[PDB]
Enzyme design. Structure first.
Site, PDB file in Angstrom:
ATOM      1  N   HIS A 149     -25.412 -56.731   3.337  1.00  0.00           N
ATOM      2  CA  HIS A 149     -26.503 -57.317   4.125  1.00  0.00           C
ATOM      3  C   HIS A 149     -25.987 -58.575   4.786  1.00  0.00           C
ATOM      4  O   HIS A 149     -25.226 -59.324   4.149  1.00  0.00           O
ATOM      5  CB  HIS A 149     -27.677 -57.690   3.218  1.00  0.00           C
ATOM      6  CG  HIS A 149     -28.922 -57.953   3.983  1.00  0.00           C
ATOM      7  ND1 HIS A 149     -29.185 -59.190   4.556  1.00  0.00           N
ATOM      8  CD2 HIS A 149     -29.905 -57.092   4.381  1.00  0.00           C
ATOM      9  CE1 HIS A 149     -30.306 -59.098   5.252  1.00  0.00           C
ATOM     10  NE2 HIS A 149     -30.768 -57.820   5.151  1.00  0.00           N
ATOM     11  N   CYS A 176     -26.197 -53.358   0.459  1.00  0.00           N
ATOM     12  CA  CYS A 176     -27.013 -54.565   0.682  1.00  0.00           C
ATOM     13  C   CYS A 176     -26.368 -55.752  -0.031  1.00  0.00           C
ATOM     14  O   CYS A 176     -25.312 -56.153   0.423  1.00  0.00           O
ATOM     15  CB  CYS A 176     -28.486 -54.267   0.360  1.00  0.00           C
ATOM     16  SG  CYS A 176     -29.543 -55.446   1.229  1.00  0.00           S
TER      17      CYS A 176
HETATM   18 CL   LIG Z   1     -31.573 -60.983   7.966  1.00  0.00          CL
END
Ligand SMILES: [Cl-]
Ligand SMILES: [Cl-]
Ligand SMILES: [Cl-]
Ligand SMILES: [Cl-]
Lengths: 187, 187
Positions: B125, B105
């Site tokens: 991410h 992430c």
């Molecule tokens: Cl998003």
């Protein structure tokens, strides 16, 4: 007013099935209380993750009612939930007030134990099917998430996001669920 | 001997990205140490789940080496990881010994901060891409899990299972990963 969720956390709960719904529901703006079945002390989950509950269940149950009561799985957690008179009272009151009850993996077996939602279509983890189906009090489904009125069930750690988003959709609607979903990078 | 994993847990970590890899790796028979960056006290994660670490990082780093060092995401957690000299030393030693480093992430941005694995193909991410790519030190990927040698990255809470199973495959092989995967009821 925001919707409110009670997540009942017992020793041996599946930590993924606990944390994913708590986190996703908080992303949806639901006020979530993580309530320790045994009291306010840290809870040792099935894979040894230790989670500190927000409150004891004793205390949290005095701050009802909740828009959803959530039962994580974990075989030993679900057994603990199944053996608790406090959980029995909470689920009976929730059923009586036509409030949502959500349970995942082995978690639905606590519904059987407390005679909740008989006649509903349910799912469970495949390994929990026979337990859940003892007596034929539910109709079984292999859907990843099953919802039959106010009984919402799901299958396992890998269905936890779908389960949590179904809770969100039920409480806060389809648009909020879709908005919460997008940043999660689901398959 | 079993393989060993160090999961570094900072305030503001994404609790799903912490718990899913810990749980899945323990399912795979990996010995996992959840090490608190700030010490042995409970850690308040991004969505307010409180996790009690197994050890302080101070202590856990004395019990190396580990077969994988895992960095959860959470923007504020990743910032904490990025600011830590202890984390810098651990990751440099792990890179130097050709040990796996896994980050999810926003977690990979701590690799940038500590100048780890430059030249690798990575993912993050979507909202962490620009941070990760500042200076052009990595090549970006939109794959849900990316592995370029000993740098293993992934995108978000919804890719956590795939990330964790990639760790398992790297350490314990494809067959163990497939065996762990089946009971999870993944999509
Ligand atoms: Cl998003
Ligand atoms: Cl279990
Ligand atoms: Cl975050
Ligand atoms: Cl199975």
């Amino acid at each position: 007013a925001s919707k409110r969720a009670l997540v009942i956390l017992a020793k041996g709960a599946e930590e993924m099935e606990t944390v994913i719904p708590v986190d996703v529901m908080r992303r949806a703006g639901i006020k979530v209380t993580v309530a320790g079945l045994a009291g306010k002390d840290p809870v040792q989950c099935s894979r040894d993750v230790v989670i500190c509950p927000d409150a004891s269940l004793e205390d949290a149950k005095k701050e009802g009612p909740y828009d959803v009561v959530v039962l994580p799985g974990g075989n030993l957690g679900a057994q603990n939930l199944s053996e608790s008179a406090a959980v029995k009272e909470i689920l009976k009151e929730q059923e009586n007030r036509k409030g949502l009850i959500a349970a995942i993996c082995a978690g639905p077996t606590a519904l059987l134990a407390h005679e909740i939602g008989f006649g509903s279509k349910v799912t469970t983890h495949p390994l929990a099917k026979d337990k859940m189906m003892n007596g034929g009090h539910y109709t079984y489904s292999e859907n990843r998430v099953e919802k039959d009125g106010l009984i919402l069930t799901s299958r396992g750690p890998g269905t936890s996001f779908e389960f949590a988003l179904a809770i969100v959709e039920a409480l806060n609607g389809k648009e909020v669920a879709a908005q919460v979903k997008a940043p999660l990078v689901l398959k």
